[PDB]
Design a protein around this nucleic acid. Structure first.
Ligand SMILES: [Zn+2]
Ligand SMILES: [Zn+2]
Lengths: 233, 129, 268, 639
DNA sequence: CACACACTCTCCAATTCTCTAA
DNA sequence: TTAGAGAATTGGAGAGTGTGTTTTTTTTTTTTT
């Protein structure tokens, strides 16, 4: 039609972008693409080979390898982990997509091991909310594995438009608006369970290990959530 | 270790395919739906799950009387005409045990069993051995 | 102190993000309620700002249930009790069973008649905002220099053994055995126990229980309990429903709690 | 639906990697074309074939594996052009009601799916090979059979390049291969880019000049000329280090803001009570203010601590920029740099001459001069970037191009003010015209800097012509006096301010160097009385509107703003025009900025004008009332 | 039952668009 | 060139409708008495 006929044709699109999280996405993708083993050959490219399989969805990364790659990136991820975690997952998806035979509907998860510092259960204060942390504990009770909705696909009932990738809070959430920009609907939506994405979910109670328990105290218990590759481990 | 469990829905002529205590194989559709009770129990949007049963087969009754084919009943009836079948049936009781022919005889008789009777509807006598 | 709750996070600054355009804003807490933005600033959608719980800011809070001291109760009365609320760094300083002089502001707050209605009872609940704790039941080279020469002083073995339990008339070999139990062997690796086990026998009314209670007060990581089934804390491990939480807890017995100390078992 | 399913099945099937076409492909494809021609206005057949994915499953395999079967290939190409027809052409406009908009979104979704499918190099390889063996023949040897095939091939490429990026998958982060980047890489590997260069440079095949221009426009849709021209061999280390440094800068800014908020609130929980009476402050009544929000807040007390902001009504909602900028894949950027270089050296003059001939002859569509002005801006900027050579763009340096751009810009300005139902679209067209005008005005400066006395001579000639004619001077004032934030984006305001700064720089230097007194039936002229036309309230209002985003503005933009305001204040003595309450709130933010040291020019100018204001205020207290409103000649009454 | 919350719809009037005079 | 009078569109006050709620004893069974 014309170069100027592009008023945002047919989208309610998101325009503020988390710059720190996107830098984490880019630089973590660089880390996955470039970090190499003692014998070279790009570690994590070989370990991404097993993610073609069914019921494999998690890549486990060594935090000391991340630190060796760059101190500032590892420090940023440690401090802003829960903020940047889905962006790391999208980086992993972009990395794994070089196979070109992956099921596109599949989710991929980043997991971290070999974190240097360890924290006690007594030290899980509000200052640690959202930070990457490592704790030791003794499992007391494990609950059944459930499917948890991670992103709902919804149908708008009064204009038949499909809204994909509705991300879930700690409450089951419908679209805030219809994806159709002129549609006035804001509560009449129907979840399509077959086209939505779920994750395996399991909650386990733990308590302080015998070594770490302070003298005379009652054991302090904690609730831990396991997801995807980690459930029933 | 504590056992995991699932709910399963039996519909139409699948009802009373099993009782509590039965070992079964269960073919069905693994189905999920939203449950606000589970959501408020867990704090995460957890979906309830159930199996929509399509086929129930007791691991006890690998062969029912209804499973017997015309080939099977023809085999059984023709095999009964051997006229040495009593010795064959006795020998088939625990074929990996040498000797104990009297034990095999008694166990064959108990395994096949007699008939319950109730003359006059007022005097029951057991048929089991 | 009668009980101490789990760590309660109190929101200090709410983080909101627009679910249409991802524009974010932050709201300060006004006496316990949020001034939620009804509209977005970047875009202009209504009711589009959603509270991002884990991007918000929180601080620690804890409830403590405190009984009046036994030494302070009037004659023959059931004890009175108050609720304290501690925050930030004073939260994790006090455990159940402790005795404290607590300084704080005596607050009075309303309680709503039921959780889905804002009518409040005319009679107010009261609690104490903790400003300061002082524990009142708590009771290096300058020691090493003394101990080095005291170890090579003559008959230091007898001196330490006689120092054990001065309040009772002396049983020399019992005190010597308890001293060697306190010091123990050397733990090395294979599987041989450095721990030393001692048994005392005699009538009821002998000094054996005084010896047990003394060395329990002395040793680190010590335990004192009765072999009788009526004991305050059991010898064996068990699992129980935490009554204030309803979740299971593995109560490891005294033998497991004293994993690097002495376990005193009276009425063995 | 089922009849379409039957014909779609009759096309054939794929097995592994080989497509087995049925013998009735020709009649089934003709039936599909018939259904598409007999579509409903809702474009139901479009939606149904997109849902069936026959373009991805049948037509691309047929195109790529049975291209020797010429009737079927021609039919498939026509069908694919029909299916890839853009949604704005399908529906005529963006629908205003939900049902047609849902159908528009469906067609747009399937177009995005087609663009995703079309990144395969094999399809563009077949297209390049068939176009190459067609164009191998002489022009006189062609007939309607081959000319129409060239039209359909180039329209297929145009349609696939035109498709908007999916709102879902436009969240790609920089340095990643978007769908458009992969499509450009497919063009590069297929070699259709070289065929486009040939078509642009060919004198015989000049008939396709408008088509080739549109292909090149949609190819360079996302790019920036100077940023693209800066690409080279050593960029990976540079961009890696830049990313790490920018990450640390962002983190430090967030930490500073967190510390300031932590100080603004106290170190006591929010339900920690306490109330104060601020005895001097009267409340909205006559009683003293009772303050409840904590003692910490009274250091920087303001009455709007607890107030909800207001809903800007729909009419007054400011215009927002249509897209974020993302750094595309480095391979694609290198390819586009090489394309732009070779195109500029080999193709650009002939293509621009041909497009100007088409516009003169009036055998072009309604708005193709927008593509012409885009090409002016992009390729002249790229030329000035890196090795500047005016010979490569000498077809554009004529005064006729200045006249054409000025006419188009004034036309778009009038149509924006009158055709109010697409005023934003007219504003975008005017923005393209403004950027082209800006690049011409920058190119003459580069000609002045360059060593050739010939280009210096012609630079003097064109400067004399432009500064003599009146419209080039009056257009800036015309734009400022009817600019609207409601309609035009802040990017347009930035470009207007920077172009005005450059224009006044050149005009001031010209008049300073030599008199050249007559202007416009001529009359006298001087730059001071020209600058006095910029003493209106509206222009400075626009300048401070741009100044509000000084945190996000470029350093050059901030220099332009502060230099213009310093010219109006220090050199024209119009400080009372800029004595304003909103401007003083902006100055308050500037002085309170923790990064105020980074804006040394702005804060120094702010303190100069503030000192002048407080001198006037000490002399006369009515200046405080004068702050409250915009003004006309009270600028002299205050003085 | 009946007294608070939660949600939708309608009307009213206040603001902005259009055309005219100072 | 500014701005003010008449007409049309949008913000939100408020009228109306629907929903949810206020330790104890007898008996069994396995293990331990
Ligand atoms: Zn809708
Ligand atoms: Zn928004």
């Amino acid at each position: 039609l014309a170069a100027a006929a592009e008023p945002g044709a047919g989208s309610q699109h998101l325009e503020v972008r988390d710059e720190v999280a996107e830098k984490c996405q880019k630089l973590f993708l660089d880390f996955l693409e470039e970090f190499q083993s003692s014998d070279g050959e790009i570690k994590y490219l070989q370990l991404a080979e097993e993610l073609i399989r069914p019921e494999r969805n998690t890549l486990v990364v060594s935090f000391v390898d991340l630190e060796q790659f760059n101190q500032q990136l590892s420090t940023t991820i440690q401090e802003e982990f829960y903020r940047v975690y889905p962006y790391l997952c999208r980086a992993l998806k972009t990395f794994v997509k070089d196979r070109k035979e992956i099921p596109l509907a599949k989710d991929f998860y980043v997991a971290f091991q070999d974190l240097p510092t360890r924290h006690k259960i007594r030290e899980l204060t509000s200052s640690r909310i959202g930070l990457l942390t490592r704790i030791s504990g003794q499992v007391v009770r494990t609950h059944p594995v459930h499917p948890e909705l991670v992103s709902g696909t919804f149908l708008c009932l009064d204009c038949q438009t499909v809204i994909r990738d509705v991300e879930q809070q700690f409450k089951y959430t419908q679209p805030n608006i219809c994806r159709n920009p002129v549609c006035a609907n804001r509560r009449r939506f129907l979840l399509d369970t077959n086209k939505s994405r779920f994750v395996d979910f399991q909650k386990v109670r733990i308590q302080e290990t015998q070594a770490e328990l302070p003298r005379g105290s009652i054991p302090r218990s904690l609730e831990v959530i396991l997801r995807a590759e980690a459930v029933e481990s | 270790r504590l056992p995991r469990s699932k709910d399963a829905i039996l519909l139409a002529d699948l009802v009373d395919s099993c009782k509590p205590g039965d070992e079964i194989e269960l073919t069905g559709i693994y189905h999920n739906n939203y449950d606000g009770s589970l959501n408020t129990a867990n704090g995460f949007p957890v979906f309830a799950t159930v199996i929509l049963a399509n086929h129930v087969a007791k691991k006890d009754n690998k062969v029912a009387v209804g499973e017997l084919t015309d080939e099977d009943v023809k085999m059984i009836t023709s095999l009964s005409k051997d006229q040495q079948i009593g010795e064959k049936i006795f020998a088939s009781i625990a074929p990996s045990i040498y000797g104990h022919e009297d034990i095999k005889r008694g166990l064959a008789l108990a395994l096949f069993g007699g008939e319950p009777k109730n003359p006059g509807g007022k005097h029951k006598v057991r048929g089991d051995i | 102190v009668i009980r101490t709750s789990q760590l309660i996070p109190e929101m200090q600054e709410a983080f909101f993000q627009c679910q249409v355009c991802a524009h974010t804003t932050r709201v300060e807490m006004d006496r316990g309620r949020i001034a939620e933005p009804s509209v977005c600033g970047r875009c202009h959608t209504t009711h589009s700002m959603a509270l991002i719980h884990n991007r918000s800011l929180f601080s620690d809070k804890q409830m403590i249930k405190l009984q009046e001291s036994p030494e302070d109760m009037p004659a023959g009365q059931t004890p009175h009790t108050v609720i304290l609320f501690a925050h930030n760094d004073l939260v994790d300083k006090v455990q159940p069973g402790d005795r404290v002089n607590v300084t704080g502001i005596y607050r009075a707050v309303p309680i709503r008649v039921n959780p889905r209605v804002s009518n409040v009872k005319s009679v107010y609940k009261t609690h104490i905002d903790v400003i300061h704790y002082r524990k009142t039941d708590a009771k290096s080279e300058k020691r090493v220099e003394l101990l080095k020469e005291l170890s090579r002083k003559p008959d230091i073995y007898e001196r330490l053994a006689s120092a054990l339990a001065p309040s009772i008339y002396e049983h020399e070999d019992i005190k010597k055995g308890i001293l060697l139990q306190l010091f123990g062997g050397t733990r090395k690796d294979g599987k041989f126990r450095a721990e030393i086990n001692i048994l005392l026998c005699g009538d009821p009314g002998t000094s054996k229980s005084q010896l047990l209670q003394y060395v329990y007060n002395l040793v680190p990581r010590g335990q004192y309990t009765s072999g009788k089934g009526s004991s305050a804390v059991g010898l064996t491990a068990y699992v129980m429903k935490d009554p204030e939480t309803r979740q299971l807890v593995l109560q490891t017995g005294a033998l497991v709690l004293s994993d690097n100390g002495i376990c005193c078992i009276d009425e063995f | 639906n089922c009849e379409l399913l039957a014909t779609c099945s009759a096309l054939g099937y794929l097995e592994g990697d080989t497509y087995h076409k049925e013998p009735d492909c020709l009649e089934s494809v003709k039936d599909l074309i018939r259904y598409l021609r007999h579509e409903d206005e809702t474009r139901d057949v479009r939606q149904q074939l997109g849902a069936a994915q026959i373009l991805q499953s049948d037509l691309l395999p047929i195109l790529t594996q049975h291209h020797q079967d010429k009737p079927l290939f021609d039919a498939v190409i026509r069908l694919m052009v029909n299916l890839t027809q853009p949604a704005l052409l399908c529906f005529g406009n963006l629908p205003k009601e939900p049902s047609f908009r849902h159908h528009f979104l469906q067609v747009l979704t399937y177009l995005q799916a087609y663009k995703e499918a079309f990144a395969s190099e094999k399809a563009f390889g077949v297209l390049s090979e068939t176009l190459y063996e067609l164009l191998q023949l002489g022009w006189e040897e062609r007939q309607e059979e081959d000319n129409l095939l060239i039209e359909r091939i180039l329209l297929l490429v145009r349609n696939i390049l035109h498709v908007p990026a999916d709102l879902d998958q436009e969240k790609k982060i920089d340095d990643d291969a978007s769908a458009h980047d992969q499509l450009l890489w497919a063009i590069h590997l297929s070699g259709l880019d070289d065929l486009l260069l040939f078509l642009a440079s060919s004198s015989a095949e000049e008939q396709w000049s408008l088509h080739v221009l549109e292909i090149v426009s949609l190819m360079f849709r996302d790019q920036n000329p100077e940023q693209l021209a800066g690409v080279g061999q050593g960029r990976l280390a540079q961009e890696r280090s830049a990313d790490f440094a920018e990450l640390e800068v962002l983190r430090q800014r967030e930490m500073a803001e967190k510390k300031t908020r932590a100080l603004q609130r106290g170190n006591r929980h929010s339900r920690f009570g306490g109330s104060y009476i601020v005895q001097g402050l009267k409340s909205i009544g006559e009683r003293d203010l009772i303050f409840h929000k904590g003692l910490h807040n009274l250091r920087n007390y303001s009455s709007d601590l607890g107030k909800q902001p207001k809903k800007v009504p729909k009419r007054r909602q400011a215009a927002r920029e249509l897209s974020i900028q993302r750094r595309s894949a480095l391979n694609v950027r290198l390819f586009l740099r090489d394309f732009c270089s070779e195109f500029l050296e080999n193709c650009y003059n002939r293509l621009m001459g041909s497009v100007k001939d088409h516009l003169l002859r009036e055998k072009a569509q309604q708005h193709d001069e927008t593509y012409y002005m885009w090409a002016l801006a992009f390729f002249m900027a790229f030329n000035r970037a890196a090795s500047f050579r005016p010979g490569l763009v000498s077809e554009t340096l004529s005064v006729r191009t200045f006249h054409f751009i000025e006419q188009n810009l004034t036309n778009y300005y009038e149509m924006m003010l009158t055709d109010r139902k697409e005023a934003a679209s007219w504003a975008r067209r005017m923005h393209l015209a403004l950027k082209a005008y800006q690049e011409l005005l920058a190119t003459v400066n580069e000609m002045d800097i360059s060593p050739d006395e010939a280009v210096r001579e012609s630079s003097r000639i064109i400067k004399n012509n432009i500064f003599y004619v009146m419209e080039y001077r009056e257009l800036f004032l015309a734009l400022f006096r009817k600019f609207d934030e409601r309609c035009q984006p802040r990017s347009f305001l930035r470009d207007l301010v920077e172009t005005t700064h450059l224009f006044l720089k050149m005009l001031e230097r010209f008049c300073r160097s030599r008199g050249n007194l007559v202007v416009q039936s001529e009359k006298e002229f001087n730059f001071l009385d020209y600058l006095k036309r910029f003493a209106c309230s509206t222009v400075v209002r626009a300048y401070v509107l741009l100044l509000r985003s000084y945190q996000q503005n470029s350093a050059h933009t901030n220099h332009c703003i502060v230099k213009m305001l310093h010219r109006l204040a220090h050199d024209l003595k119009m400080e009372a025009l800029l004595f304003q309450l909103s401007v003083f709130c902006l100055f308050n933010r500037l002085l309170s900025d923790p990064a105020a040291g980074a804006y040394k020019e702005l804060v120094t100018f702010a303190k100069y004008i503030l000192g002048k204001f407080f001198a006037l205020a000490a002399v006369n207290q009515k200046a405080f009332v004068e702050l409250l409103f915009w003004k006309n000649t009270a600028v002299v009454r205050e003085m």
